[PDB]
Structure 1
Amino acid sequence: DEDIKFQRENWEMIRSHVSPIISNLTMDNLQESHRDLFQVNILIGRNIICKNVVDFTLNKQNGRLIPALSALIALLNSDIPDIGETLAKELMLMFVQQFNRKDYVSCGNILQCLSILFLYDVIHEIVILQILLLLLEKNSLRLVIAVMKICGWKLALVSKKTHDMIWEKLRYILQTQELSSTLRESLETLFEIRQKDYKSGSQGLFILDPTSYTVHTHSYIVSDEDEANKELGNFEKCENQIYDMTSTNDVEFKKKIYLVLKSSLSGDEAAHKLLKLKIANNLKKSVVDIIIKSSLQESTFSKFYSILSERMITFHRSWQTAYNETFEQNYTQDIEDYETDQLRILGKFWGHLISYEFLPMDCLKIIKLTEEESCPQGRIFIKFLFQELVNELGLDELQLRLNSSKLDGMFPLEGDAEHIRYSINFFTAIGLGLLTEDMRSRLTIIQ
């Protein structure tokens, strides 16, 4: 019969849809998992969707995924109360079976599920407490602590008076009665958390607003024969904006940094005033650009902007990357606009930070000395840079740092003799030719 045939693969595919959704259920995937789950006929696969939750819980690979699982149930209980209505039933009997079985591993699996569901208002506080009365009627203490660690936060909010009575009997356990040792230390840890207020039993996937979960708080008691509806998981036979072309927010910020920068006496004062403002990290690249441009209005290099920039870098590492990003942004882009009076300010400015290791020598590797990838004003910037390296460090100490720098831009060694003839001709034009002793040995071998 083709109708039994059609319904069976329909029953199969629904069963083969729910099981990979539950096996892929995780936090930040809950909403996409629930969406796809909604389009499959949940109501026809009523016990199928329940049993796939129960078995994925029980398996003991999970337990970790229990709050992810319980959050889906509250979504389902919000959407269809009957789904959570049936699913809360099976978890009661699974507890009652394994408590009677004394399967301590499987009990705690169910109890973590029942705890979180109470955290997600699926089930009533009543059904929780009576389990607690049964467990505390025997010892059962390994089970009951994992319950109260996760649920006692919400439970003391809702049912404080009876909950306090649970603690008072629980407190009578430790002090006036003798207990096995390993169990006992776990019991007093609960007391410790109790002063600590439960702040590590109160984190999970509260996706649903308290009015977006339709409040089907199922009031079922673990003393109610619960109809154990395994049968619906069998197969059957249904005969059934304004665009911003202006930057006036930036200009009022660009004025405020300039007014800080002119109202100070020393560079340590202007540095503290810029660190007082607590500038956000997207603007700290722009604050360096206001400092450099205001250093070019000065018409002469100043030690003010150096010791300003030194206290920026040693404060936090995000200022140090901001000067590293600006030194590349100045050399590769901004050299074409700058006059030769402004380039002697910058080369002495960047020459000062490099000679005192506020910027590394590896930032000089970006600069390349060729005929092609060189500017006539860029060679002027290199000239005033190396002079501040010579005057501060000396000619021997600068020789040591350039050998440790292993750069290829200033120093071509692998070949291309027209570039070696270029760089010797450029460095001797600066007035520093003692460093070109390596290249002239490389040049005459090529000849």
Structure 2
Amino acid sequence: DEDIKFQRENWEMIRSHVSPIISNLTMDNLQESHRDLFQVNILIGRNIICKNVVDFTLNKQNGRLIPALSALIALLNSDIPDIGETLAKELMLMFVQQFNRKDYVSCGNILQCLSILFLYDVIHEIVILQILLLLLEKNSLRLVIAVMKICGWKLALVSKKTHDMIWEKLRYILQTQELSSTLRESLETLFEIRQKDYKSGSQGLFILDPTSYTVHTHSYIVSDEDEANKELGNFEKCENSQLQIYDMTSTNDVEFKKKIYLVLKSSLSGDEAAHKLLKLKIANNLKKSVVDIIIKSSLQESTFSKFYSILSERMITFHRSWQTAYNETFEQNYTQDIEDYETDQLRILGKFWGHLISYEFLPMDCLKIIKLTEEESCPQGRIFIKFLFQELVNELGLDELQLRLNSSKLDGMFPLEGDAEHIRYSINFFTAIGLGLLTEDMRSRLTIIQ
């Protein structure tokens, strides 16, 4: 037959689609695990989906992924109340079997599965607490405490009178009865969470609204028959308006520039100017824009001042994001903005950066970006190096400056590797500055080559 044929590989693929969904169910993937399941025929594949979730819960690999598992079942239950109807039936029989088998591993697998079904309003309260009576009839205490850690949140919200009486009966055992040792600290841990109020047992995937889940609170008990419809999991033979205004005005960036300029101009000292900037609590994406205003306020002066340098150091030693805005601004000043600046403004820049480089608020490795070349050195860029290095010589002294230029590996300033016309350029640069003592290593390499 081709009709018995077609209905079998249709029955095969429906099996072969649900099982990779159930294996690939995780948090932040529930709605997509629900999407590809909804296009699969759940109504025909009714025990195909029931046997895939019950076996995957029980495997003891899971136990962590139970709160994601029941969240799909609640997505099923509001779509179809009949899907979770049989799926709530089998988990009752699974416990009633394995409790009479005394299977503590497989019971507590189901016992965490049923409690999160109650948290997701799949099952009633009466099915849960009547399990809690049959567990509290014998010992079974390593099972029943793991239930009441998870289920006791919602259950004390709904059925608080009966649920206290269970707490009332359970408390009789710890006080006036001898028990085993290792289970004893499990019994009193259940009373330790009562006073901390269950804030470590109520986190999960409530991914339906309290009305978006059509509330099919099934009123089962574990004392009734549940019909065991295993005959569906086999094969059978069916004869069946925002207005997007572009803003070119940039009033916002002008109004923020006035606020920062006024913080600076109202301050006596740079310690008190940095305090007011740190008080504003500027966002991370605006901090590069703040270092840019501070430098442009400083170049409007006639001379350098310690105010802008003292203020800058207070921001860098506050938090490492202000450190990053100063490392980013030093490259913007050298690579983009050099052409814009007049010679009087390059005195204030090189003394500003050379002061922060010499007291180590910037690394000496920030000078790595600088490359001395006939072709790729700006005339206004070379005026920046002279003013930055005159400041480094004055603060450190020349003998201390040779220690730090040796410790860094900056090749564009001091090339020892070749290209002998560039070695000619650098020695000629630094002796014009007044630093021939720095050049003496490069002077050896040139006479060898010529």
1:390 aligns with 2:393: yes
How far off its partner does 1:373 sit?
2.4
1:4-37 CA distances to partner (integer Å, 9 max, x unpaired)? 1111000000000000111111111111111011
Find the residue that maps to 2:183 and give its secondary structure.
helix
Find the residue that maps to 2:115 and give its secondary structure.
helix
How far off its partner does 1:137 sit?
1.1
1:293-341 CA distances to partner (integer Å, 9 max, x unpaired)? 1111112111001110101011111110111111111111111111111
Give the structure 2 partner of residue 245 of structure 1: 248
Task: State, as a whole percentage, how many aligned pairs show the same letter.
Answer: 100
Find the residue that maps to 1:215 and give its secondary structure.
coil
1:84-124 CA distances to partner (integer Å, 9 max, x unpaired)? 11111111110111111111000010011111111111111
How far off its partner does 1:217 sit?
1.3
1:186-224 CA distances to partner (integer Å, 9 max, x unpaired)? 121222222111111111111111111111111111111
Find the residue that maps to 2:382 and give its secondary structure.
helix
Give the structure 2 partner of residue 73 of structure 1: 73
1:116-166 CA distances to partner (integer Å, 9 max, x unpaired)? 111111111221111111111111111111111111111111222111112
Q: Distance in 1 between matches of 2:250 and 2:86?
A: 60
1:164-196 CA distances to partner (integer Å, 9 max, x unpaired)? 112121222211111211111112122222211
Q: Distance in 2 between matches of 1:142 and 1:186?
A: 8
Find the residue that maps to 1:396 and give its secondary structure.
helix
1:220 aligns with 2:223: no
Q: Distance in 1 between matches of 2:337 and 2:316?
A: 22
Find the residue that maps to 1:181 and give its secondary structure.
coil
Q: Distance in 2 between matches of 1:419 and 1:159?
A: 86
How far off its partner does 1:248 sit?
1.6
Q: Distance in 2 between matches of 1:408 and 1:86?
A: 75
How far off its partner does 1:380 sit?
0.8
How far off its partner does 1:242 sit?
1.3
**Larger displacement relative to structure 2 (68-77 or 364-373):** 364-373
Q: Distance in 2 between matches of 1:234 and 1:362?
A: 72
1:395-415 CA distances to partner (integer Å, 9 max, x unpaired)? 111111111111112121221
Q: Distance in 1 between matches of 2:154 and 2:439?
A: 77
Q: Distance in 1 between matches of 2:182 and 2:152?
A: 22
Find the residue that maps to 2:62 and give its secondary structure.
coil
Structure 1 segment 274-289 matched on structure 2, within 5 A: 274-289=277-292
C-alpha distance 335-155 of structure 1, shift in aligned 2 (>3 A): same
How far off its partner does 1:244 sit?
2.0
Find the residue that maps to 2:321 and give its secondary structure.
helix
Q: Distance in 2 between matches of 1:37 and 1:15?
A: 11
How far off its partner does 1:368 sit?
1.6
**Larger displacement relative to structure 2 (388-397 or 239-248):** 239-248
Partner of residue 421 from structure 2, selected from 407, 418, 428: 418
Q: Distance in 1 between matches of 2:30 and 2:204?
A: 12
**Larger displacement relative to structure 2 (39-48 or 123-132):** 123-132
1:27-51 CA distances to partner (integer Å, 9 max, x unpaired)? 1111111101110111110100111
How far off its partner does 1:371 sit?
2.1
Q: What RMSD in Å do the two structures reach over aligned CA positions?
A: 1.0
For structure 2, list consecutive stretches of 5 or more residues without a partner in the other structure.
none
Q: Distance in 2 between matches of 1:363 and 1:157?
A: 62
How far off its partner does 1:347 sit?
0.7
1:251-290 CA distances to partner (integer Å, 9 max, x unpaired)? 2111111111111100000100000111111111111111
Q: What TM-score do the two structures reach when normalised by structure 2?
A: 0.98
Q: Distance in 1 between matches of 2:235 and 2:129?
A: 37
**Larger displacement relative to structure 2 (12-21 or 122-131):** 122-131
Find the residue that maps to 2:182 and give its secondary structure.
helix
1:389-445 CA distances to partner (integer Å, 9 max, x unpaired)? 111111111111111111112121221111111111111111112111111111111
Find the residue that maps to 1:137 and give its secondary structure.
coil
Q: What TM-score do the two structures reach when normalised by structure 1?
A: 0.98
1:323-380 CA distances to partner (integer Å, 9 max, x unpaired)? 1111111111111111111111111111111111111111111222222321111111
